[PDB]
Design a protein around this ligand. Sequence first.
Ligand SMILES: [Mg+2]
Ligand SMILES: [Mg+2]
Ligand SMILES: [Zn+2]
Ligand SMILES: [Zn+2]
Ligand SMILES: [Zn+2]
Ligand SMILES: [Zn+2]
Lengths: 588, 588
Amino acid sequence: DKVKEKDVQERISALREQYGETWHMDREHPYRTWQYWGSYRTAPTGSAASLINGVVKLLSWPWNAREDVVRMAMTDTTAFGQQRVFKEKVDTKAQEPQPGTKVIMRAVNDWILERLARKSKPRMCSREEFIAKVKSNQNRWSAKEAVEDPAFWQLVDEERERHLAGRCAHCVYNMWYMWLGSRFLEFEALGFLNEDHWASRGSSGSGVEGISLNYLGWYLKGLSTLEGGLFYADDTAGWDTKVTNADLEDEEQLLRYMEGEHKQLAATIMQKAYHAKVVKVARPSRDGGCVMDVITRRDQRGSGQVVTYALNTLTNIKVQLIRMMEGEGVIEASDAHNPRLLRVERWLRDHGEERLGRMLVSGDDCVVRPVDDRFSRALYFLNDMAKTRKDIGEWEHSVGFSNWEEVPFCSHHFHELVMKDGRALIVPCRDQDELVGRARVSPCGWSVRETACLSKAYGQMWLLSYFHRRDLRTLGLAICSAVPIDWVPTGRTTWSIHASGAWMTTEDMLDVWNRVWILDNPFMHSKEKIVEWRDVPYLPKSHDMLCSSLVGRKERAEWAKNIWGAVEKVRKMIGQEKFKDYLSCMDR
Amino acid sequence: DKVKEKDVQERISALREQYGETWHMDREHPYRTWQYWGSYRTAPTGSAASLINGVVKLLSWPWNAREDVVRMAMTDTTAFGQQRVFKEKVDTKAQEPQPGTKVIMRAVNDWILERLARKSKPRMCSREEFIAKVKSQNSSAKEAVEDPAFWQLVDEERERHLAGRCAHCVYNMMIWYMWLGSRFLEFEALGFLNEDHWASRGSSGSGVEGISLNYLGWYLKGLSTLEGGLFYADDTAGWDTKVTNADLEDEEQLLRYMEGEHKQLAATIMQKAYHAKVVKVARPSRDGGCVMDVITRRDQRGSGQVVTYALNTLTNIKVQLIRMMEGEGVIEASDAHNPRLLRVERWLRDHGEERLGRMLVSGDDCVVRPVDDRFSRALYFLNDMAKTRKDIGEWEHSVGFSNWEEVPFCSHHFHELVMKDGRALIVPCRDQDELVGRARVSPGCGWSVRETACLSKAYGQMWLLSYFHRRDLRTLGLAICSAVPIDWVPTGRTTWSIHASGAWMTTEDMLDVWNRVWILDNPFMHSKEKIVEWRDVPYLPKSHDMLCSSLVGRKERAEWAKNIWGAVEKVRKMIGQEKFKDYLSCMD
Ligand SMILES: [Mg+2]
Ligand SMILES: [Mg+2]
Ligand SMILES: [Zn+2]
Ligand SMILES: [Zn+2]
Ligand SMILES: [Zn+2]
Ligand SMILES: [Zn+2]
């Protein structure tokens, strides 16, 4: 059994036995720090067998040999598999922090919301807005389809009216997301955090919301001009399962800045839906089919909440701001017991604004440039707050970097390139094998056209952000020469919230390049457009090979030669459509 | 010496001591779990020296210095060889399954037999049938069936079978081989299993009888589109020796779908010939000669029984339905000795028929695609029906595959291949050096230059038809066809697998037959435009060609494939003044 857990708030919500035909109670259930409330037969779904995108396979055949380009479809959407992941990574309980720590945390936290709030007040959001966002991309309906049928709104109206009263009956997680009705209720109460850009750099000081990968490098580089210690870029092992109750209570202080129906609407979401969670988890039944368990708990963050990104940013800002304090000397392990609160409030009054600009924080990822490297050893309040660092001993010093071009952020590194005309670019880089490998994974039942379109998405994206990788420019230019001109791209190419998506057009890819890298790039003073791909730079060849490029081997050499043969196969595969030749505009 | 013995159904059979001139009774015989009934002197036969095909050695001299083409040379057919193989692999007793296991077995089995009976009922097969097969014991079987004396012999043993006694159905273990009259008796009784295609995919669900090896890959790749776990392709260590008495009785309940003469002729074959075995095994005498032992046994299967494939398929379908059911929850190891029979009856009726289509079963070989990867730990009932997985610990978890292209089946992998015209092929593949090694083996001493040439053509055309996608094999196959006369018709078996079409034992143009099997008669090719020249048939990716053995790069080969025409000429001058065409030059 669990120790800390939900109580009477879960009742109205668990007490939809609308799967009553199959409701039962599996005494042999696995859950330990979650609370088992019953289960019901559900259609078994998921698979462990990998599906491979054929057009990307055809065009990138040396990547068969490579090993880390195949483990991306070592996935497992099967109940049995998902259950294993859950029992290893989700079913624990974070050690909540000691009471002094909690006092420092509330101090820093409330300081942060105060800052944020004075720029733009909390606010409710309109159905007409939810409509717009839906219209830009329990089951009686698409998403566009649902928001039209007034029966849908008549449903949210029912649950909304319940929330105003302070209960809800429908706001359950499918392990970790919800359905349109409750998703609108979130968006209404808390959607201001996203739509009013509370996690932007202007608002939160150290957030980076709204900056694409294509400009983030300028920010990394700007950090190197400050006085201080090394760049630090520790990562927290499994952030969402370490969001403690202290953490959640701190973020509920956002409620104070609201009033009226908005404060109520918000508080039900914040402390029923989010803090008294009711989760649907699939699990294999002992009779050849699939059961769904209903579990509850208090802490941890549901990864698919409407405002996970914002809250994780604000919360992680606070964690880093505290770590800064410990390392500077403002707090020490003593303060975990009887904290010197006036000491932290002075530091915020006197240095908070400056420390804010010393870090880039995007959800659970940071880059931190502290005033000196005492930050390495400053692990007490970090471990106390449960934000246990990945792949390092609990009390082992954090290792830093003096070259910003080596600091990892948002799954990337950033390098500076100088073009032929003397203008500098700072480009996002990533493992070539990691990027091809995700493109080789198919979302079955995807027709030759739908899979061609998904590939163009990857190819177009590679041209916006990894044009500086020989292998990828070639491979993206080939994909665009093998997929019809007017097939609009479709599909998810990245999950980062720094994805432009600017490549899901059917515009010329050079033309979008100039748009993002020059015309709209705020760091380009001169706005002279570039005319041909031959004038867009590359990384230095050493860097290319080192970030796992095939450049060098007979493999890559012979692949590059025979690559038109591949392109023609895909064309013949696709039929009598309009193709154009972008590969040859490599002076080839 | 044994503990599970035959009795009185052996006596009339072993009552041919009409080898009596030398019949005796070695007190120094080696049999533990077989029964000794007497030896008798025979002409010593068989060799352990490798006799290598002349023409294939001339045209592929690289592979001489290769301990992969000479591992096939070492086949010892001396009575001492046979004997040593026997004692190690065949003279054992499988542990018989537990009583509940046994119930579950007859439960699942009966489900299966009923299902196919309801689709086609057991029948007899006429002598017209048997005569027709033959067109395709002291000449050939073609002659043996025209002389009505051989047929009078049949009736003699036929009337004894109707009586319930066997005189001549005895196995030769050159555990099985038989003489014409006795084979017809088996064929007349049980031969519907073959002639009515009971192991057909359409009839058995999991079977693959009739699918050419050139088409199976479409079936493998189809499985990937199923929701489920990984692919599993455990291979059982020496299947036929683990076919237990349990297994045989279950098969025997096939008699409940016959009436009258049938149910007796068949009950005799199944219960006398198949289940009370009299086997002739050679062993070396102690006076410079051979002696044939006459031994008997209850269980195991003869490999050359007329319906070994069908019976083996069916019983394996049963074994694997049971293992799913262990790892699906339906069966819990505790009910090995007190069976929850109702569970397995529900599973069968509700889920069962869709489970049939997640397996590919061909004799003792399967590809299974379970509901989830619990199947990898479900080894209690698999170890209980004695079907021990080979090359892995008895309780060690199975290892799956996510990529259908990495799944092995019928001694082959399958890869997808896109042609220049854009159509897709799924070709079978196998280790190049095992393939050439088998051709380098001459089937007998005193084969003449003419007949060993004919046998090399048989291999060369087979390679051309199913392994055309290997650079080295296509060369070798084409060279062989250029060194052997055009009007010389291929002879001999080039493969024992039941999935061999044989379509290559023609003297027709190989491209012609290529197009007929890959396009014209190919059910998975919905465009029947034909291919004018070999230069248009695809290859396997050059990287995939050298991982799957091959030389390709290897200067040793570039030398070979340079002056291979020097070898063709040698073989021609060797053969004579005959009609030769130059198939090599239609290539690059
Ligand atoms: Mg990082
Ligand atoms: Mg196998
Ligand atoms: Zn609700
Ligand atoms: Zn890089
Ligand atoms: Zn007989
Ligand atoms: Zn292969």
